Ligand binder design. Sequence first.
Ligand code: ATP
Ligand code: ADP
Ligand code: MG
Lengths: 52, 52, 57, 86, 342, 353, 117
Amino acid sequence: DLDLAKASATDQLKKAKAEAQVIIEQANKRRSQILDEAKAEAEQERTKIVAQ
Amino acid sequence: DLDLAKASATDQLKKAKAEAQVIIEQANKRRSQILDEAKAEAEQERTKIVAQ
Amino acid sequence: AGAKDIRSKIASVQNTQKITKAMEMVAASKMRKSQDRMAASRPYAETMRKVIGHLAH
Amino acid sequence: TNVISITDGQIFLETNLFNAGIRPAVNPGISVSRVGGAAQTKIMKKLSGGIRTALAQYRELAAFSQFASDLDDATRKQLDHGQKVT
Amino acid sequence: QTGKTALAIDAIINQRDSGIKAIYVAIGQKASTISNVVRKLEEHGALANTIVVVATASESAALQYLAPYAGAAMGEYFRDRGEDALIIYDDLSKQAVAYRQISLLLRRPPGREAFPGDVFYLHSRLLERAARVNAEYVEAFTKGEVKGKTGSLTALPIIETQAGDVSAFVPTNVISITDGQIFLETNLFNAGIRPAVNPGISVSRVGGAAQTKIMKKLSGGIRTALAQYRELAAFSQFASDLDDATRKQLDHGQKVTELLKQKQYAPMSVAQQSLVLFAAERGYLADVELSKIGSFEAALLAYVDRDHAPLMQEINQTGGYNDEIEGKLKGILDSFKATQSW
Amino acid sequence: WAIHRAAPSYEELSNSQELLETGIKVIDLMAPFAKGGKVGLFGGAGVGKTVNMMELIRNIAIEHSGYSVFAGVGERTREGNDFYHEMTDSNVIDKVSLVYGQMNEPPGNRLRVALTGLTMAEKFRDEGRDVLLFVDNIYRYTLAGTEVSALLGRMPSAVGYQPTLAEEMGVLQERITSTKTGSITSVQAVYVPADDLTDPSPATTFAHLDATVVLSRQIASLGIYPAVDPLDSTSRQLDPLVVGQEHYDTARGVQSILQRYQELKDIIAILGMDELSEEDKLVVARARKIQRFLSQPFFVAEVFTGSPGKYVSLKDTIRGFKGIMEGEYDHLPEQAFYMVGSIEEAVEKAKKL
Amino acid sequence: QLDPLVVGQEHYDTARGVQSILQRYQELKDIIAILGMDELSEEDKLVVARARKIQRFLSQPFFVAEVFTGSPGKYVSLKDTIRGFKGIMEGEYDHLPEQAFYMVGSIEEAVEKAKKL
Ligand SMILES: Nc1ncnc2c1ncn2[C@@H]1O[C@H](COP(=O)(O)OP(=O)(O)OP(=O)(O)O)[C@@H](O)[C@H]1O
Ligand SMILES: Nc1ncnc2c1ncn2[C@@H]1O[C@H](COP(=O)(O)OP(=O)(O)O)[C@@H](O)[C@H]1O
Ligand SMILES: [Mg+2]
């Protein structure tokens, strides 16, 4: 009984660890995106201040 | 031993489904740490660029 | 030492390097032929072990 | 090196080729004409294209010559042609 | 194109808050590059603490030859008043070429590689002014207006060398004038190991006397372990003879080099550096993958920035290494390794 | 105007670091030009040097509003004649000025021709344009300065060069910059004596070059045009801090794929394709698609290919190589990418190929 | 001063033995560079192993280098060094690893360091 049971239960733990990297990968992606946005606004703000 | 083993296989099958979730839970927390530190560094950087 | 003999050494080592590249290519091809000759040696021993197994065991 | 800067090409004559009995000792791949096919007549322009590639392939497979070529075929045909044009 | 300038301006920028005045002398450089450097100094706010001296590649050779001597004369003002200053000479090889031009236009008989023999005397009298002076000199110079302080001028000359040849004339002249060298290798730089410092050649004759106690203790033999790891890797490429301790020596060296690379314009304080060195040599990078090393530090320096901040403020103030501080560091690395993820 | 001037002063230089959008996929990806930079063309004749020069002249005249100046320093009169005919029979001649110093002229002529070209480009800059200056060999400027210095009897230096070598190079190269009104970009052919990169002429020149384009006989043998080599061509504009992280990552990516492919192509040569894993076969496939997609048809090349020429914006090259690297477009064949244009044109080629 | 009459035969003979081995190792470096060590003769491998041990045993910690090495310094008497080199050349230490000879004052310290690996 532990045959199908251990294989299918351990496989889903391997999946959950793989998916844990997926979650953390997306967080670092959005951190990059958030960084671009903040930097672009800061430089745009500087552009307007200098023109004024 | 069939009744012990069928229960013990179910106990095991239960256990991996739980532990998969607590990994995925912890990963979503770690994401939330990474993104909040992304918001903090995003603001810290902007305060430099305006002084420039 | 002396640039005219150094240039002679360079040409000698360059010629040596081409020939070793040729020997690498040949050794790979001979490995292939000798591993085909290897597979053909299996069936004789495998069936002889089955006959010995039949009598012995 | 001055006159190689001035001219349109060179015919480069090698003494090891001369000693080997390649005579005239023209050394291909380091002798070249920057005018090229425009100088030739149509027939020579048509036929000479193969010789240049054939001799270059002979230079690559010259390393396999002295050490034996018994371990390859298609190359043994490319080598055989390359030596016969040489 | 090995990061010589990047390393020198990142040194300038890190003195932005350390109270050391900075001077940057650009000899024979491109004016576009010089304006971009000045704009990067201003972008980081270091510019208010620097003097910049310019002689572009377009200008007469005499202006280039006298360019570094002019820069030295400004640096000596701070030294003689008992302050500290740092001076960068952006290419002393370009000064020597300019002096060679002027010297040969005056028909002076050339020597090795066509430089005059005066070319040692040229770079000698320049660099030998970068000095530290005792308080009796500062008092006697300033007629007693400053008591008990000691001034210094710190110099980082740059030499560009052809194909990495450390045995050419002008490189060997300056190696014989300075107190050491940092040798930057293009093979490391092209492999992405940046800054591309080659141990075994690089040295500081002054020695640890320049380090803080904590940095002196935590660094120790890390230099010679890296030099040996690079030599072992050379023979290990050639044959297979792996005897476990070789395997662990290779893993440790590969993790240390992956830990020593660093980004441009991202300086890190002595508290951060001492944690990184502590984590490397107390073995904590065991169980950590090479592809995880950069993540491991970024998480660790955020962890210590978040919670155990007061120690950081202590180690940055006085670079003191105690058993109390070692215990706190041990608890921080034990808890991080056990409790956090990267 | 007089040919002799000082370079722009410190306050005149542009307070920014713009790129030039050449329109060529290999160049704009792998070796981007700073506006007002110096580029070295490190290839021998046989490889398309002049057609590449004519394509840049066309794109900067049409797709910008720039003019070009060509300075033939120490050129063979024959090649000077038939470069003029190849430009006149390709309609680019109305958008370039030609100054020729033929080798049969005394040394003083050849030295000063380089400055005559530069002063004409300075006029077009002062009108506010962005300008291309082509120097047909920078080595022949160096050697003209040596010969004149020897005639004047000054003591030689280094490997027998003039004592003023670094100054005379600096006097030329520092006038070629981006100012606040316009810019001069330069593309300079380089010859390396004895194949020696340590010789003072190469060593002095490489201090001034920003980008470096290598042209290959092998890539031409593949039929891939333009025949730029992606692994030896480089630019010091490839950093995130100036070019941004998407472009940097993409250029680093295709370099890694092409390098790995070269190693795999040696393994295939000694041991055939049976040694490759699925990962290796995917790498080899994408590398062949990337190699195909670096080809392009020029408006100058229509005489041969007959295909209409294409100008490709930098965004479209970044989209294309991002796509091929991350395994999109794996489902359409490699010959769809060859000589096509944009990646959007590659798939539309594929649909009936 | 390196004469049998001035320094005695045992010193002279040990110094010429060290030079003879180290020169022979230089003669082997070109074949080692091209082909590596496995194509050497079976006693040429022994020469290379002794020469590398001799090269490392010439190294020594200095009392003025504690600012650099940090290792304590060493003073080695003449009698003690010639005994060490003679013993390596006779091969009584041919079972220690190379690293054991690096930066050690006397042969004793090499066998002690080999106990610490
Ligand atoms: N820490 C780093 N990481 C990655 N790249 C770097 C780093 N530091 C410098 N570089 C890169 O090195 C290149 C050359 O920088 P830099 O000009 O300082 O080097 P250099 O050897 O001083 O050049 P030059 O010799 O022209 O003066 C630039 O692309 C720069 O971005
Ligand atoms: N895009 C292209 N399409 C077709 N042929 C090309 C292309 N680029 C270069 N060639 C060919 O390359 C060869 C050499 O070009 P060319 O400009 O004459 O080089 P060079 O002038 O340096 O000898 C010519 O046959 C030319 O047709
Ligand atoms: Mg620099």
